[PDB]
Motif scaffolding. Structure first.
Motif, PDB file in Angstrom:
ATOM      1  N   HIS A  48       0.858  -1.164   0.000  1.00  0.00           N
ATOM      2  CA  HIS A  48       0.000   0.000   0.000  1.00  0.00           C
ATOM      3  C   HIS A  48       0.905   1.229   0.000  1.00  0.00           C
ATOM      4  O   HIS A  48       2.083   1.101   0.321  1.00  0.00           O
ATOM      5  N   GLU A  49       0.366   2.393  -0.368  1.00  0.00           N
ATOM      6  CA  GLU A  49       1.046   3.672  -0.420  1.00  0.00           C
ATOM      7  C   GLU A  49       1.784   4.009   0.891  1.00  0.00           C
ATOM      8  O   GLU A  49       2.851   3.458   1.156  1.00  0.00           O
ATOM      9  N   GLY A  61      -5.185   3.022   1.865  1.00  0.00           N
ATOM     10  CA  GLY A  61      -6.368   2.246   1.543  1.00  0.00           C
ATOM     11  C   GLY A  61      -5.993   1.152   0.548  1.00  0.00           C
ATOM     12  O   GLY A  61      -5.684   0.040   0.972  1.00  0.00           O
ATOM     13  N   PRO A  62      -6.038   1.429  -0.763  1.00  0.00           N
ATOM     14  CA  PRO A  62      -5.772   0.455  -1.808  1.00  0.00           C
ATOM     15  C   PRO A  62      -4.309   0.034  -1.908  1.00  0.00           C
ATOM     16  O   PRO A  62      -3.441   0.449  -1.150  1.00  0.00           O
ATOM     17  N   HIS A  63      -4.064  -0.873  -2.850  1.00  0.00           N
ATOM     18  CA  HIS A  63      -2.758  -1.442  -3.129  1.00  0.00           C
ATOM     19  C   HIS A  63      -1.993  -0.520  -4.077  1.00  0.00           C
ATOM     20  O   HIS A  63      -1.648  -0.940  -5.182  1.00  0.00           O
ATOM     21  N   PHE A  64      -1.768   0.737  -3.678  1.00  0.00           N
ATOM     22  CA  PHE A  64      -1.200   1.768  -4.534  1.00  0.00           C
ATOM     23  C   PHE A  64      -1.960   1.817  -5.865  1.00  0.00           C
ATOM     24  O   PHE A  64      -1.449   1.436  -6.918  1.00  0.00           O
ATOM     25  N   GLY A  82       1.045  -2.236  -6.832  1.00  0.00           N
ATOM     26  CA  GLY A  82       1.456  -2.475  -5.472  1.00  0.00           C
ATOM     27  C   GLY A  82       0.751  -3.720  -4.904  1.00  0.00           C
ATOM     28  O   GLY A  82       0.432  -3.750  -3.718  1.00  0.00           O
ATOM     29  N   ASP A  83       0.536  -4.778  -5.702  1.00  0.00           N
ATOM     30  CA  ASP A  83       0.334  -6.121  -5.153  1.00  0.00           C
ATOM     31  C   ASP A  83       1.241  -7.124  -5.852  1.00  0.00           C
ATOM     32  O   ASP A  83       1.436  -7.054  -7.063  1.00  0.00           O
ATOM     33  N   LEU A  84       1.784  -8.053  -5.058  1.00  0.00           N
ATOM     34  CA  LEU A  84       2.458  -9.248  -5.539  1.00  0.00           C
ATOM     35  C   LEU A  84       1.444 -10.393  -5.522  1.00  0.00           C
ATOM     36  O   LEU A  84       1.269 -11.083  -6.524  1.00  0.00           O
ATOM     37  N   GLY A 114      10.045   2.938  -0.287  1.00  0.00           N
ATOM     38  CA  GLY A 114       9.291   4.012   0.345  1.00  0.00           C
ATOM     39  C   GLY A 114       7.899   3.560   0.788  1.00  0.00           C
ATOM     40  O   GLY A 114       7.393   4.045   1.797  1.00  0.00           O
ATOM     41  N   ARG A 115       7.280   2.603   0.087  1.00  0.00           N
ATOM     42  CA  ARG A 115       5.876   2.310   0.312  1.00  0.00           C
ATOM     43  C   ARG A 115       5.723   1.409   1.535  1.00  0.00           C
ATOM     44  O   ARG A 115       6.700   0.814   2.000  1.00  0.00           O
ATOM     45  N   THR A 116       4.496   1.279   2.042  1.00  0.00           N
ATOM     46  CA  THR A 116       4.208   0.421   3.178  1.00  0.00           C
ATOM     47  C   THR A 116       3.776  -0.970   2.707  1.00  0.00           C
ATOM     48  O   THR A 116       2.667  -1.154   2.200  1.00  0.00           O
TER      49      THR A 116
END
Ligand SMILES: [Zn+2]
Length: 153
Positions: A48-49, A61-64, A82-84, A114-116
């Protein structure tokens, strides 16, 4: 070369370390990580962002989702950028965060550095559309452990 770390803890009774490394910038990242304390079985594994929030999650919220990406697992053609997909935890809640994607990087910009990173409650949808939140984001279920990625050389 030069590794990023994501110490994943967040809030759920989980604790882990991602070690992100790659030879290049523009090339396939070799994700290995040794997460524990999950519930057993499948767990969505999504980035996520949530950049400069505080330290961990606060915010995302979303997966970037840049505008309107669709979900998909590793096997799918599509995915959010931003999902594997997911991992599977044994019984000491130990997962095996071994992935090798070719879309993302650990350089900057479109990299996920940088992302979470987040480890989730249920399996992700894989892009079957078990429901709908499936395609919209991935229907992982709730966030457990997370942390901003990049915290090594
Ligand atoms: Zn997704």
């Amino acid at each position: 070369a030069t590794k990023a770390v994501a110490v994943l803890k967040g809030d759920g009774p989980v604790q882990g370390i991602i070690n992100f490394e790659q030879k290049e910038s523009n090339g396939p990242v070799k994700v290995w990580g040794s997460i524990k304390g999950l519930t057993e079985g499948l767990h969505g594994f999504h980035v996520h962002e949530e950049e400069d929030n505080t330290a961990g999650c606060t915010s995302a919220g979303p997966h970037f989702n840049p505008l309107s990406r669709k979900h998909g697992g590793p096997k799918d053609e599509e995915r959010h950028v931003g999902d594997l997909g997911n991992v599977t935890a044994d019984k000491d809640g130990v997962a095996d965060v071994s992935i090798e994607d070719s879309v993302i990087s650990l350089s900057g910009d479109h990299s996920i550095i940088g992302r979470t990173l987040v480890v989730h409650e249920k399996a992700d949808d894989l892009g079957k559309g078990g429901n709908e939140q499936s395609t919209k984001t991935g229907n992982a279920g709730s966030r457990l452990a997370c942390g901003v990625i990049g915290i090594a050389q």
